[PDB]
Amino acid sequence: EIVLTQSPATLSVSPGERATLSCRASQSVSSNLAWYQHKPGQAPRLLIYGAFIRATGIPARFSGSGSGTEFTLTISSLQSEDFAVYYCQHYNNWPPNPFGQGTRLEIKRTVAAPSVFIFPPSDEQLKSGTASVVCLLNNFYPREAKVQWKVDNALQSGNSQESVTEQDSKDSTYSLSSTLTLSKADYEKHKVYACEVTHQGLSSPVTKSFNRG
Amino acid sequence: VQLVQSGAEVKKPGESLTISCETSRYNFTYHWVGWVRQMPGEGLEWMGIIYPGDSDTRYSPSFQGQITISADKSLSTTYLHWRRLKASDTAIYYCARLKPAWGRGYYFDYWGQGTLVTVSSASTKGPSVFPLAPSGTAALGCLVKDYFPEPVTVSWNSGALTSGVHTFPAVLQSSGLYSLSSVVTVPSSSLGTQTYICNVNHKPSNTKVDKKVEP
Amino acid sequence: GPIICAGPIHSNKSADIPHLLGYSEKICQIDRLIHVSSWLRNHSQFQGYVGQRGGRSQVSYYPAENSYSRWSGLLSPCDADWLGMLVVKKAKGSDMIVPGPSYKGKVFFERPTFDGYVGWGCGSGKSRTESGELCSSDSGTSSGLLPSDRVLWIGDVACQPMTPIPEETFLELKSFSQSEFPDICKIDGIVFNQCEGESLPQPFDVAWMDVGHSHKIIMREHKTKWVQESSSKDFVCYKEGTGPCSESEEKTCKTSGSCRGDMQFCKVAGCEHAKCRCSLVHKPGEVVVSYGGMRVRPKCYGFSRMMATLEV
Ligand SMILES: *[C@@H]1O[C@H](CO)[C@@H](O[C@@H]2O[C@H](CO)[C@@H](O)[C@H](O)[C@H]2NC(C)=O)[C@H](O)[C@H]1NC(C)=O
Ligand SMILES: *[C@@H]1O[C@H](CO)[C@@H](O)[C@H](O)[C@H]1NC(C)=O
Ligand SMILES: *[C@@H]1O[C@H](CO)[C@@H](O)[C@H](O)[C@H]1NC(C)=O
């Protein structure tokens, strides 16, 4: 019944810089707070327990502080492996959900606009009953991008799925793909298929479209 | 201190599973061990912990009646067991070693590597591969559609084209099948000169497909 | 699939519509699209029924990609209407009809709105134009026993018994939702953010929850968990071959410990193995939402299309 929120949900901070993650509790938990790091696709690792006691084998550049209602995980100078999801966890009682929701640490960089591509369904696929239309947002930053599909100028709902890559190691950008899925019946009943992309890095929304041809 | 978990599982809803966590390099009888689940794209949930000494087993109320955690001191090993899985059991599962805090709860001072448990009525099915045609720099890719289970691995020109490649995380469709794209950026010059071939792999189905992408 | 009752076959288009009392009785009503039938009679001067041969499991959805209807036991907004948890109001002239659904020929459609739930009906012998603007004479409605294809529920929505939250935490939520949608001015006619330049209304697909207050809480970055609560609403009682049990027959079975049930019914209420049987409704549970640092159990939760105006 005692709730822990880690805000922000995403902290964007430059490598080499200093990272300060917050964990705030809804009721005092004294110093019964622990902190975990969760690497991409590995096991979690304990960093801090007791709000400030460094766990065995953890680099000095991680430090814990706080007691009561405000807790901070600080990383003194960020290294490459340090970009990961960080969880806070209380043990004042043993409720069903003593974990915060986690904060994701990402590499901060300069705003970069996506390059947009749209692909019509292959002929080979269209013969098997379904038409899949793919929009590609390439190498942009920040991750927050908004993508809308419009067929014959009508907005779409329910017929698309977005996927995002992890951050590039070289330029630290993201790429996104949106796939719009339609049956040959519906796909052939319409003429203009248009991908509309909105992002901090564009002055105005970008459209890429095709006619069934 | 090492917690080593059993391998990955693909199971049908309505079925039984036992997954194990083998412990070593510390006396297994007086440390609490327990199991934590990470549902796809969610955070961490504890399921239940056990003290192998007196066999005191305690579950999270949400998991009570759904599972059995048990221990075997001779083998220093914990077990997690469902007698009937649902498709919402699809998750990663960790064993971990706990430390107590007297009257209070616990923290997790050591974690096993994870076990991915997928639960789905789908049979194994290899991907179908459709090209994304390109229509300065141009983009092109391969659509990889309706396979089960994960993973697939996509390469380009038998691994020679490595720069500018994005292979996306797959998605679960409404049909139960996974779907996923791989794209490349390429200079405009090369199309009509260079040949572009994506090579798709799906180990579970023993399928390998090579598709040529074209103007 | 269906909860209890297989597809209705009406023949008396003027037949009485009984107010039943059992939970499992009105559940079987809901199952037979009869709640939507009663709606059209009360508000739109319509003779008969919708749902013939089809029932609830053949109602149409927009988008067609709807996941909560793959669970028979999740309540659509019309269904919570027949059980008393909310009101699906008759459409006014100000209620904006949202573009995108295939409206042509529907006799009843419903959408969640920013401040409630609105239904539009058609009279006897009429159905909707393609745009959805009007009701016009239709030959295929003359029967007055119309198929489920004529009922449209806009959205992927689930409704449930809610846990009330205080005003303070509602305001506290309303502000976070404003923070994640700063270039919105109004939704469905209601002021969302203060603006100067506000555009014309346009389609707006969004996730939202109803927390039992003056309007919905629309959400961008939220999280949901489902808790199998296996309480008394989670079971329906029925007589195999002759349909649901009576208010009596059901209430005795949720109290006596004497009747038949499935594994979960015996475990929580009491078995003895004719008589009525009660079983769990097929659903993933009660939904709980995590948004902006609060954990709430809303009245309704889903992803629907509304009308909103943008900043200029
Ligand atoms: C782990 O520790 C336990 C208890 O501290 C050990 O069990 C005891 O072992 C001694 C001699 O080895 C006996 O005299 C006691 O009767 C045992 N007590 C119990 C409760 O088992 C155990 O041997 C240790 N195991 C390892 C592998 O170190
Ligand atoms: C059947 O129709 C007749 C005439 O329309 C009506 O009087 C009667 O009430 C209807 N059935 C029942 C059960 O009332
Ligand atoms: C229609 O009116 C009757 C009469 O009060 C009422 O019992 C019933 O609940 C109403 N149905 C709907 C769907 O409003």
Side-chain angles (χ1 to χ4, degrees), chain C residues 19 35 38-39 42 81-82:
Chain C
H19 195 267
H35 54 311
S38 154
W39 200 94
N42 291 9
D81 165 270
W82 201 237

Side-chain angles (χ1 to χ4, degrees), chain C residues 123-134:
Chain C
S124 193
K126 309 156 137 235
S127 72
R128 286 280 155 176
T129 58
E130 182 202 53
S131 100
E133 51 180 293
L134 294 174

Side-chain angles (χ1 to χ4, degrees), chain A residues 99-155:
Chain A
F99 280 116
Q101 303 221 316
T103 294
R104 196 186 163 245
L105 260 204
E106 89 174 341
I107 321 171
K108 195 186 257 295
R109 50 146 297 166
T110 65
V111 164
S115 343
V116 183
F117 301 82
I118 176 148
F119 308 89
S122 83
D123 300 330
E124 158 184 1
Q125 166 188 196
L126 251 181
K127 214 38 47 175
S128 75
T130 331
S132 298
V133 180
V134 181
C135 200
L136 161 64
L137 277 50
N138 213 15
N139 298 279
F140 56 87
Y141 188 94
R143 180 265 179 264
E144 309 105 30
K146 142 195 199 208
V147 176
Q148 304 191 298
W149 281 105
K150 309 223 216 181
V151 189
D152 284 338
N153 234 318
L155 190 81

